[PDB]
């Protein structure tokens, strides 16, 4: 037998961080032909999206 | 008795593993793949598998 060992260090924050973020539109501006949505994706430092 | 394992505001419902929520009652969202399964549970299962 052989077991693959996880990195267990320097790979994940202990900081309370959201795993899955919902972004809701700042502006919508609905019209008869289309339905625009305008988002604002804030990615802080240490976050990679 | 108090240490939740996610415990880092990880999931959209940090305090439980919401396996499914009825979409008819659903208002905020957090349902995935066109059924009552949740975003958190879908992410967990897809990541594990």
């Amino acid at each position: 037998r052989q077991t693959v060992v996880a990195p267990t260090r320097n790979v994940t924050t202990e900081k309370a961080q959201r795993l899955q973020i919902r972004f809701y539109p700042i502006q919508t501006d609905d019209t008869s032909t289309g339905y625009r949505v305008r988002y604002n994706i804030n990615v802080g430092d240490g976050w990679v999206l | 008795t108090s240490i939740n394992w996610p415990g880092n505001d990880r999931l959209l419902t940090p305090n439980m593993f919401e396996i499914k929520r009825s979409v008819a009652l659903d208002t905020e969202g957090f349902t995935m793949s066109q059924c009552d399964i949740t975003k958190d549970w879908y992410l967990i299962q897809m990541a594990t598998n």
Binding site: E14, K15, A16, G44 | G7, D9
Partner: peptide, 16 residues
Amino acid sequence: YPFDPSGVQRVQLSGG
């Protein structure tokens, strides 16, 4: 920031 090397009862450490 606080580094808590306690094998029981760490801090939440929300941070930012």
